Amino acid sequence: HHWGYGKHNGPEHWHKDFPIAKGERQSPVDIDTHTAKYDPSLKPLSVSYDQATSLRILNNGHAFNVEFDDSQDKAVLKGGPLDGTYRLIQFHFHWGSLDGQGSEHTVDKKKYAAELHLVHWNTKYGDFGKAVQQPDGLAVLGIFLKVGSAKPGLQKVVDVLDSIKTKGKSADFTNFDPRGLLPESLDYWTYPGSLTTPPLLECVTWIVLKEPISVSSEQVLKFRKLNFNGEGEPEELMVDNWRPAQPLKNRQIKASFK
Numbered sequence: 001h002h003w004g005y006g007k008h009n010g011p012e013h014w015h016k017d018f019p020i021a022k023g024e025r026q027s028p029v030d031i032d033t034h035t036a037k038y039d040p041s042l043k044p045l046s047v048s049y050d051q052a053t054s055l056r057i058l059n060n061g062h063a064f065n066v067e068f069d070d071s072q073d074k075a076v077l078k079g080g081p082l083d084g085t086y087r088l089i090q091f092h093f094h095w096g097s098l099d100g101q102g103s104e105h106t107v108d109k110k111k112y113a114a115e116l117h118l119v120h121w122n123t124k125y126g127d128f129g130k131a132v133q134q135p136d137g138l139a140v141l142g143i144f145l146k147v148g149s150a151k152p153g154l155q156k157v158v159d160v161l162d163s164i165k166t167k168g169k170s171a172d173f174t175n176f177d178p179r180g181l182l183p184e185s186l187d188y189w190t191y192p193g194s195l196t197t198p199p200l201l202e203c204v205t206w207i208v209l210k211e212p213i214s215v216s217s218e219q220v221l222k223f224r225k226l227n228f229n230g231e232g233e234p235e236e237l238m239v240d241n242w243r244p245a246q247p248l249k250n251r252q253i254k255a256s257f258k
């Protein structure tokens, strides 16, 4: 009886194994666009992904992770609200059963069809495992997906999902360029929060881009053919793997833009 997204093991249950689920800096949150404060002192965000080395794609039973070689400063996030250098370790998505839901963050209570999380760890802590124990350990770049035109830079991800249908399957996934997943604008909201899955550690500077990317109905349909279950278990479609909005409590969302 492990955590999941079902009636018996979903987000309303997580607090029993992970009591920080009811903590002071949980994620995601609703972004109230009229309450977020423009902070003219935020530096421009620096996304340096030209030397990014993708290695592998994994179905972990909750999502799929596209994993990167994080053994050198090859794909880094810097600037914006961040002090120092954060190394890209993986990206994943959260998505719905229907185009009307799927994102974790909301914007004036609007739910997008999906949300991309590019996960980076603070190099001052040496590895990801130590970084997640620090209040400034991670920087997650959050990008909303809406359904419309195809995102060409996503198709290589969509085409390998057949090969990782069930929990614990992986596949070689070299030479994937995550720059093909970014929108034009790097305008963002930022606030201190958490992982959105167990163990829900309060180690994340969230950087949520204002501009969504467009993906095709056919692209998100392929996300929804994945399985939470392992091979030769009853089929449970990997859908609605999103945590809903948590209490803002004593936190200020800042906007990089007027």
Ligand SMILES: On1ccc(F)cc1=S
Binding pocket: 117, 119, 138, 140, 195, 196, 197
């Ligand atoms: O869901 N998830 C899992 C790992 C991680 F580092 C960040 C997030 S958002």
Ligand SMILES: [Zn+2]
Binding pocket: 092, 093, 094, 117, 196
């Ligand atoms: Zn996530």
